[PDB]
Amino acid sequence: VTAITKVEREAVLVCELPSFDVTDVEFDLFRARESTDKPLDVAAAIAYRLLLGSGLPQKFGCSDEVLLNFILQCRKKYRNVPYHNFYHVVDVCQTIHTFLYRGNVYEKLTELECFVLLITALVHDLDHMGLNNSFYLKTESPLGILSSASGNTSVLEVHHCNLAVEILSDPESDVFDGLEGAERTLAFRSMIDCVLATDMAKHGSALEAFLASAADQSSDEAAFHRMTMEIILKAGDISNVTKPFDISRQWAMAVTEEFYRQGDMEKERGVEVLPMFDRSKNMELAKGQIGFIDFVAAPFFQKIVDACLQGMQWTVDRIKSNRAQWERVLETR
């Protein structure tokens, strides 16, 4: 609940980032982290410089100090877990920026929707513990019991939304305080809709709803704009396979460690451990990444690009080149 201090803000403001272009599709967050012994300050500086460079906070009445306060209140609520940590949400922010401004998806949205998407990236996984929704339901954990008694099986995504609303309830960290009326209501409602759409159990229904709205935009522009926002946050969230191979591999190694730590905790509790969570099977990262590409990511990116996001064609080309690299790992074993 405590306010951000002047010392906390100066430690971010001093980071310079000399050799990096944070707007580039080949920006390497792993190298930016290695280039300093304060990587949490460098990650915060990347988010701050990307948002201020856009001119969007200035246009919407958000001061430089309220923006930095917001970034540092978000950083405080991420945990030291292998993948779902502050570096993941800064990476999703940076990646969404490239989709809007190098993929030209900004042409399909308002400037306010673009500002909301960059802000929502930073709140999307607040307080993640490296355990998925199925863990909380299968173990009858207290949060699983509350979800069940509530109605909603999106255990984590409702939790992330609750903490986003807490941060924004203080005017000193409220990046939407300069909005009023319909604009303020749209910022909150679109932020919450996008976070709830990141639950991978809704993946099929979110993709079908986007493709239907993209085929008939003028008959419901409100629905088309809302579904494009959901599909861009989702695209950012599964974007690791769209990156240069070595960046892609480092993310895959980090998600794999989280899956295995969940499996180990499921064994202690004597509950069912699905094979990809079982540290005892012969790991095999190339087989897992090819399966993720073939069943989830390749059909997602190819369909959204063919339906209307033509500027994002590089994502499809990189997924193909990364799949071919994983194939060669297997062919040379």
Ligand X SMILES: COc1ccc(C2=NN(C3CCCCCC3)C(=O)[C@@H]3CC=CC[C@H]23)cc1C#CC(=O)NCc1ccco1
Of 172, 173, 189, residue with least CA distance to 181: 189
User: Judged by CB under 6 A, does residue 255 bind ligand X?
Assistant: yes
Q: Which stretch binds ligand X (CB under 6 A): 99-107, 171-179, 220-228, 234-242?
A: 234-242
Give the binding-site size for ligand X (rule: CB under 6 A). Answer: 17
Nearer Cβ to Zn ion, position 73 or 120?
120
Q: Among ligand X, Zn ion, Mg ion, none, what binds residue 244 when CB lies within 5 to 8 Å by partner kind?
A: none
Print the binding letters for residues 117-156 with ligand X: x by CB under 6 A, - otherwise: ---------------x------------------------
Alpha-carbon dihedral angle through residues 85, 90, 93, 99, given to the nearest 10 degrees: -100
Strands (E), the chain: none
Phi then psi for residue 153, to 5 deg, are -80, -5
Q: What is the footprint of Mg ion within residues 132-191 (CB under 5 A)?
A: none
Containing 122, the helix (H) or strand (E) segment is helix 111-123
Q: What is the footprint of Zn ion within residues 208-247 (CB under 5 A)?
A: 237
Enter the DSSP assignment of 80. S
Q: Is 124 assigned to a binding site?
A: yes
In the complex, the smallest distance separating the C-beta of residue 6 from Zn ion, rounded to whole angstroms, is: 31
In the complex, the smallest distance separating the C-beta of residue 285 from ligand X, rounded to whole angstroms, is: 6
In the complex, the smallest distance separating the C-beta of residue 135 from Zn ion, rounded to whole angstroms, is: 16
User: Judged by CB under 5 A, does residue 125 bind Zn ion?
Assistant: yes
**Largest Cα span, the chain:** 61
Helix (H, G, I), strand (E, B) or coil at 328: helix
Active-site residues, by number, are 84
Enter the DSSP assignment of 309. -
User: Which residue of 11, 238, 265, 316 would you call a contact of ligand X, by CB under 6 A?
Assistant: 238
Q: Which DSSP string corresponds to 163-193?
A: HHHHHHTSGGG-TTTT--HHHHHHHHHHHHH
Which tokens belong to 180?
A: 């009023």
Residues in Cβ contact with 25 at an 8 Å cutoff, skipping those fewer than 6 apart: 98, 102, 314
Distance (Å, whole) CA 161 – CA 24? 29
Q: What is the footprint of ligand X within residues 277-316 (CB under 6 A)?
A: 285, 288-289, 291-292, 295-296
Q: Is 128 assigned to a binding site?
A: no
Q: Among Mg ion, ligand X, Zn ion, none, what binds residue 252 when CB lies within 5 to 8 Å by partner kind?
A: ligand X
User: Judged by CB under 6 A, does residue 69 bind ligand X?
Assistant: no
Nearer Cβ to Mg ion, position 73 or 198?
198
Residues in Cβ contact with 128 at an 8 Å cutoff, skipping those fewer than 6 apart: 78, 79, 81, 84, 85, 156, 160
User: Judged by CB under 5 A, does residue 91 bind Zn ion?
Assistant: no
Give the binding-site size for Zn ion (rule: CB under 5 A). Answer: 2
Which tokens belong to 209?
A: 């709803």
Distance (Å, whole) CA 291 – CA 175? 39
User: Which residue of 52, 163, 265, 276 would you call a contact of ligand X, by CB under 6 A?
Assistant: 276
Q: Is 69 assigned to a binding site?
A: no
Q: Which residues bind ligand X (CB under 6 A)?
A: 132, 200, 237-238, 240, 251-252, 255-256, 276, 285, 288-289, 291-292, 295-296
Residue numbering of the annotated binding site: 84-88, 124-125, 157, 237, 289
Residue numbering of the annotated binding site for Mg(2+): 125, 157
Q: Which residues bind Mg ion (CB under 5 A)?
A: 125, 198
